[PDB]
Structure formats: structure tokens, C-alpha cells
Short mmCIF file of C-alpha atoms and ligand atoms in Angstrom, two decimals:
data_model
loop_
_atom_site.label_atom_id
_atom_site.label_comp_id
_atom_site.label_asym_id
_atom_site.label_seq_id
_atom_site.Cartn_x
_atom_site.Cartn_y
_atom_site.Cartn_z
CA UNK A 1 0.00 0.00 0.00
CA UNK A 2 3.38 2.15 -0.55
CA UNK A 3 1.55 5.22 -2.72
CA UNK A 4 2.71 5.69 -6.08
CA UNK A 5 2.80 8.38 -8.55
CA UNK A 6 -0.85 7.55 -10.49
CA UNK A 7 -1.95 7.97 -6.86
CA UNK A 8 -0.62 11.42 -5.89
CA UNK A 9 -2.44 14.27 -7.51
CA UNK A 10 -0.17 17.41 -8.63
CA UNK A 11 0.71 19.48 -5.84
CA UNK A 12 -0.41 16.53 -2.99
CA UNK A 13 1.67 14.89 -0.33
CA UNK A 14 1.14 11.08 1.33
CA UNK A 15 2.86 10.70 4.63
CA UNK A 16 3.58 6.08 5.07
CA UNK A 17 3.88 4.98 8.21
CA UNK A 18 7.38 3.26 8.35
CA UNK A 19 7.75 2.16 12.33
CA UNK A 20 6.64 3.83 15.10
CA UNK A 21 7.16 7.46 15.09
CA UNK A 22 9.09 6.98 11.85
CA UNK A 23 6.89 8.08 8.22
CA UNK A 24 8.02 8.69 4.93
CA UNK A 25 6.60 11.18 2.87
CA UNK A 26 5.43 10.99 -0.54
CA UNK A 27 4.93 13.73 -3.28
CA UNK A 28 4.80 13.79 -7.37
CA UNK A 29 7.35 16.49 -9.77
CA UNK A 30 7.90 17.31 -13.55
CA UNK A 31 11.33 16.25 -14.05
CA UNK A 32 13.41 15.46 -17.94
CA UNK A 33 9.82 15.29 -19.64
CA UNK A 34 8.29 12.70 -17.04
CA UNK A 35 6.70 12.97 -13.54
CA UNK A 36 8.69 11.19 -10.44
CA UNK A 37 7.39 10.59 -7.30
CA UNK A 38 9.96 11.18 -4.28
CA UNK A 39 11.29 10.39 -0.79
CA UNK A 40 11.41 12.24 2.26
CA UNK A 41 11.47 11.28 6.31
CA UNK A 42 9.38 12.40 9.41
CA UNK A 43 10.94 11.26 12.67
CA UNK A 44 9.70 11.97 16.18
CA UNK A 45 11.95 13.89 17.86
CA UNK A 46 10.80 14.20 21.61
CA UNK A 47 8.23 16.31 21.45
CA UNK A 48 8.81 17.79 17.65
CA UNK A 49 9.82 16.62 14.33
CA UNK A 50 12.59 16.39 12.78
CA UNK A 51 12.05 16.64 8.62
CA UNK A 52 14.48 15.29 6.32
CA UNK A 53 14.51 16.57 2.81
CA UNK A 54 11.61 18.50 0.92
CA UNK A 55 9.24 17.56 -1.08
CA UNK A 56 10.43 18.65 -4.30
CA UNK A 57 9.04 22.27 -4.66
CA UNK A 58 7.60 24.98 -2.90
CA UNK A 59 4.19 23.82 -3.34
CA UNK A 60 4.77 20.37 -2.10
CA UNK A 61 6.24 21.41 0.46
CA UNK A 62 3.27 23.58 1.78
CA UNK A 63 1.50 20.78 0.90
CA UNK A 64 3.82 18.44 3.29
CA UNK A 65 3.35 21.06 6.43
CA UNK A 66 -0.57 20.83 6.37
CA UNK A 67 -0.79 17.19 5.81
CA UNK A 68 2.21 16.48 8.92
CA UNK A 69 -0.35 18.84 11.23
CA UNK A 70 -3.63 17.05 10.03
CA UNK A 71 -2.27 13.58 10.30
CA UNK A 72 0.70 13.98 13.16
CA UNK A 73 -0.06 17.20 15.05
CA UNK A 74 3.39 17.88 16.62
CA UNK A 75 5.54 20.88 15.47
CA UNK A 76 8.63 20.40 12.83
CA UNK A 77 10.93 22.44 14.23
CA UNK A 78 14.25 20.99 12.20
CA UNK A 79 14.91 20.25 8.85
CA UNK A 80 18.25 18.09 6.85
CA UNK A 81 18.40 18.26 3.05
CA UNK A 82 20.79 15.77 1.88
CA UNK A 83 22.00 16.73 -0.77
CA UNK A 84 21.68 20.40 -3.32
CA UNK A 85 19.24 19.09 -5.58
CA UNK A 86 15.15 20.55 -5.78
CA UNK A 87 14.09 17.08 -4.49
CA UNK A 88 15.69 17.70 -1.38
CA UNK A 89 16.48 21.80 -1.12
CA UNK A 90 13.29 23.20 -3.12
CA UNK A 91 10.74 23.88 -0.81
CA UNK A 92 13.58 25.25 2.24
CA UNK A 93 12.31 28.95 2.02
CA UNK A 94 8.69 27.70 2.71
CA UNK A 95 10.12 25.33 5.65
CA UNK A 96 11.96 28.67 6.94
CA UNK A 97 8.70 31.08 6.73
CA UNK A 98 6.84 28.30 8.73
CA UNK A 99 9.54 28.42 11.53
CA UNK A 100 11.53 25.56 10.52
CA UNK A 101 15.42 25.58 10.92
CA UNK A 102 17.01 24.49 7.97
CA UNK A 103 20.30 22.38 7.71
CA UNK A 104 22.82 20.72 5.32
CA UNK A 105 26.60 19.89 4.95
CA UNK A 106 28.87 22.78 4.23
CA UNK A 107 29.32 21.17 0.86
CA UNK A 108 25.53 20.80 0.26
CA UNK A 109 25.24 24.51 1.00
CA UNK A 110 28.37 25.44 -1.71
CA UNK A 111 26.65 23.52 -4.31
CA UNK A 112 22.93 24.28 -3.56
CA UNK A 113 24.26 27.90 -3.52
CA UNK A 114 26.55 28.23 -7.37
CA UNK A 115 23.41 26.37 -8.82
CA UNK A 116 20.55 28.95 -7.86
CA UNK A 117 18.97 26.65 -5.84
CA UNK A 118 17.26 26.92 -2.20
CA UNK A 119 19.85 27.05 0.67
CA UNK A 120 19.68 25.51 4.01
CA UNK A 121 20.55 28.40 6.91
CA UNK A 122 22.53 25.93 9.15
CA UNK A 123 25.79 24.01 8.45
CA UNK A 124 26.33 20.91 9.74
CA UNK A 125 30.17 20.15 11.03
CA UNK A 126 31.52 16.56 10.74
CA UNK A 127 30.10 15.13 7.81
CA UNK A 128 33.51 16.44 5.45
CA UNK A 129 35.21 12.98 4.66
CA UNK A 130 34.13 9.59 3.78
CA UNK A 131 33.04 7.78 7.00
CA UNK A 132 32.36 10.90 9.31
CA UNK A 133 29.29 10.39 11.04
CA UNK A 134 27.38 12.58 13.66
CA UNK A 135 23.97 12.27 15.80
CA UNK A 136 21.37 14.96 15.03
CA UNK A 137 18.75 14.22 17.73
CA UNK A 138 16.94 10.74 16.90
CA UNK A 139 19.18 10.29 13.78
CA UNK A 140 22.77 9.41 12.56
CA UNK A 141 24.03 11.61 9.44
CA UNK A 142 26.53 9.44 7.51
CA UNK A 143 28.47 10.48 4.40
CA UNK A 144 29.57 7.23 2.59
CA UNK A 145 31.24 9.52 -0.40
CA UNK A 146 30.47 10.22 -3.45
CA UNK A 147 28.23 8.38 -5.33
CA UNK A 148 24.42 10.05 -6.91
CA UNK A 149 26.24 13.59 -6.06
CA UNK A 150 29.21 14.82 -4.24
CA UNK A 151 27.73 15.68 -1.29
CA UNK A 152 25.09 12.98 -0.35
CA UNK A 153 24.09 12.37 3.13
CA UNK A 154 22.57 8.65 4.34
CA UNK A 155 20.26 8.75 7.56
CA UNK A 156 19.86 6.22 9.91
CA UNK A 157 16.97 5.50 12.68
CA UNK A 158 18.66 3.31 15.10
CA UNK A 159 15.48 2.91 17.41
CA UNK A 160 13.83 1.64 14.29
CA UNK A 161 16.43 0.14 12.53
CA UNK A 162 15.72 2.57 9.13
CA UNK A 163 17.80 3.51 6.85
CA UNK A 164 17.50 5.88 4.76
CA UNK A 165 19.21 6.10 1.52
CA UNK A 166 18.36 9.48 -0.87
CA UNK A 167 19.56 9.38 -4.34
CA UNK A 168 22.46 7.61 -3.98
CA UNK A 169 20.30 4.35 -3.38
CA UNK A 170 17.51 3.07 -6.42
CA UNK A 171 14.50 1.12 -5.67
CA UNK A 172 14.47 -2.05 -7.20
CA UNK A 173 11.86 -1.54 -9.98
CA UNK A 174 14.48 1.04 -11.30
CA UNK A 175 16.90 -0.40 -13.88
CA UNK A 176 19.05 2.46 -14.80
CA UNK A 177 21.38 4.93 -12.40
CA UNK A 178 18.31 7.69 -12.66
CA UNK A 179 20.10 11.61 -13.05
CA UNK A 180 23.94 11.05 -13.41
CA UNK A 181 24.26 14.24 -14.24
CA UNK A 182 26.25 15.66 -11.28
CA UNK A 183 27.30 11.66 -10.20
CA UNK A 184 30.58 9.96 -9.69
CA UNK A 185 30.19 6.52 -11.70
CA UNK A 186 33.65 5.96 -10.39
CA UNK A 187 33.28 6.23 -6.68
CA UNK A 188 29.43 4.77 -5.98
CA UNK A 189 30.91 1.46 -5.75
CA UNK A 190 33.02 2.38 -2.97
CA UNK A 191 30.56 4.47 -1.24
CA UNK A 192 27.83 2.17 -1.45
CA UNK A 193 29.67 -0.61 0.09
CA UNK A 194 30.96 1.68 2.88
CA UNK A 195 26.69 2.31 3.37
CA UNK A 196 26.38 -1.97 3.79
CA UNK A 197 29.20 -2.20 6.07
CA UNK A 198 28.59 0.78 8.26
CA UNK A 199 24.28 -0.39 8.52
CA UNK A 200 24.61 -4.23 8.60
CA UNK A 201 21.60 -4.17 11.33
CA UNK A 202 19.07 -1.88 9.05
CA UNK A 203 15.73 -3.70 8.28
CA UNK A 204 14.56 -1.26 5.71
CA UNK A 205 15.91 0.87 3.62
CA UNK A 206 14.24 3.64 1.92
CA UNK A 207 15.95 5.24 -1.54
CA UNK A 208 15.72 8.61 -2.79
CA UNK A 209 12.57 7.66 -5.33
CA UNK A 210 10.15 5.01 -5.05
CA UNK A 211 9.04 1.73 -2.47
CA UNK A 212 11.01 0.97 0.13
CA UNK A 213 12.83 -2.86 0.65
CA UNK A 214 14.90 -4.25 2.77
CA UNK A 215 19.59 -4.34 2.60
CA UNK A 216 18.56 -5.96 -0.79
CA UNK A 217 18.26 -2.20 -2.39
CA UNK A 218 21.84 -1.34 -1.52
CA UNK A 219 23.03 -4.77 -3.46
CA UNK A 220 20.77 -3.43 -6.42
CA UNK A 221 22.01 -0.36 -5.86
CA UNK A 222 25.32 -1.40 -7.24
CA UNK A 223 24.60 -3.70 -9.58
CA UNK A 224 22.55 -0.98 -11.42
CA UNK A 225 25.12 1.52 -11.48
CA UNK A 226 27.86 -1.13 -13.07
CA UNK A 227 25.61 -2.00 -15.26
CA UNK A 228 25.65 1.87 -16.08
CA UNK A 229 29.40 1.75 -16.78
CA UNK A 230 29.33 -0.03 -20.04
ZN1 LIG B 301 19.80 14.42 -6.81
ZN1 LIG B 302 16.46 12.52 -6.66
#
């Protein structure tokens, strides 16, 4: 009962229930002459909620707010894009006017930043070399290296046991590498296998676009993007 794209109206959001105080959300874009749907995470945070990434545009992201208050009813206060792309930054200057506090890596912010695109207020320290990891309330903020962009971020739940993979991890009914545009081919390898070793306990894992699985994604994962190479 994941929802998928010839569910979601234009402009709507679905929020899945992953585990206990853990949801995804769900929303729909124009992207390359087709329309995607997209990732994003929800986790409780105390008393708050702590977003991770946007819902791909200003409008789903209004959309997200309303739909987190009707269904959820505790404040987001915090919010992590994981990488500089729309599907994770557009959407930050609505999270900002609603009182949300908006983060992302140095690197995220450089990038996000030359391209014209939204930028997160808040920097995050520790996340600058392959391996670094830091808490951020009820999450851990991993960089594996670089892999779907230079600068993408993996999130872990450990009360839950989610992980949570962004771009830099395909769903299995994907066959290609998806945008490779701003990608290292050479380095995903690496970086993705860093991800398996580093999460060997993680019961589902959740990529950037499309239905969730299980450690099997992260095999696929790399499979797909050797497949790419040739
Ligand atoms: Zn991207
Ligand atoms: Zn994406």
C-alpha cells in the first residue's frame, strides 16, 4: 500500500507509516519530460519533528506542512536536506517562513548555492570525509562519499532500525542509475559498500525515489550503477 505516482495528484503529499514514530513522505514532480514521485522522512523527535529533505518544490512542500499537522499534530521544528538538488532543497524557504530551521553539509550549501537553488541556513560540522558520522537528535548523518552527487548524506533510525538512503540508493523496480548528471560513476561502488558495512543491522531501507525494501536495495544499488558503466 506504498503510494505511487498515479496515486498522488499534482501538488499533494502522502505521509507512510514506516515504524513507530518513523513516516516517509510521498509527493509527485515534472522532471526530464516525465513525472517522479519522491522520498522524504518524518521522525519523532521528543516532542517535535525532525524533517528530512523536501518535497520537491515549494508547493509540495506547503503541501507536506498541512498534511504532517492534520495527520501527526506535533511541530517540525528541524529540517536536513541531503544533498543540493530541488528534491531535497526546493521547498527550504517555505520550511523557513513556517519556523523551521534548515540544515545541510557545508558542501551541500556550496553547491545548492553556485546552482541557484534553495539554501539551508545551518551548516552541519563533521560530515567532510568519507566515513564521518554525527547524531542529530533521533538520527545518525553518515556520508559514505560520493556516489548520486558529491555531497550525499545517508540517515539512519537506530530505534527503528531505518535507513534511509536518498539518491544515492535506487529502488528495485528502477533499472538504470536515474540523473547522473552531477554523479561519480567511479566512486558509488566504494561508497555504497561503505553504506552496507557501516548499517549491517538496518531492516529497511528507503531510496531517494520510489518503495522501500529491505539491505537488498543497496546490493541493487550497485549492480545498477555497473551495469551503467558499459
Ligand atoms: Zn539528486
Ligand atoms: Zn532525486
Amino acid at each position: 500500500e506504498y503510494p505511487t505516482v498515479n496515486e498522488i495528484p499534482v501538488g499533494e503529499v502522502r505521509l507512510y507509516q514506516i515504524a513507530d514514530g518513523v513516516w516517509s513522505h510521498i509527493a509527485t514532480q515534472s522532471f526530464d519530460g516525465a513525472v517522479y514521485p519522491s522520498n522524504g522522512l518524518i521522525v519523532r523527535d521528543g516532542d517535535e519533528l525532525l524533517l528530512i529533505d523536501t518535497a520537491w518544490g515549494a508547493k509540495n512542500t506547503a503541501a507536506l506542512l498541512a498534511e504532517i499537522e492534520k495527520q501527526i499534530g506535533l511541530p517540525v521544528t528541524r529540517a536536513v536536506s541531503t544533498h543540493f538538488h530541488d528534491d531535497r532543497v526546493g521547498g527550504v524557504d517555505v520550511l523557513r517562513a513556517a519556523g523551521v530551521a534548515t540544515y545541510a553539509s557545508p558542501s551541500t550549501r556550496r553547491l545548492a548555492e553556485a546552482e541557484g537553488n534553495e539554501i539551508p541556513t545551518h551548516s552541519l560540522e563533521g560530515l567532510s570525509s568519507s566515513g564521518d558520522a554525527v547524531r542529530f537528535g533521533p538520527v545518525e548523518l553518515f556520508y559514505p562519499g560520493a556516489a548520486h552527487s558529491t555531497d550525499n548524506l545517508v540517515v539512519y533510525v537506530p530505534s527503528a532500525n531505518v535507513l534511509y538512503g536518498g539518491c544515492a540508493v535506487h529502488e528495485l523496480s528502477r533499472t538504470s542509475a536515474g540523473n547522473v548528471a552531477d554523479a561519480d560513476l567511479a566512486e558509488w561502488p566504494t561508497s555504497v559498500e561503505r553504506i552496507q558495512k557501516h548499517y549491517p543491522e538496518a531492516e529497511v531501507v528507503i531510496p531517494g525515489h520510489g518503495l522501500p525494501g529491505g539491505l537488498d536495495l543497496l546490493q541493487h544499488t550497485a549492480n545498477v550503477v555497473k551495469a551503467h558503466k558499459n
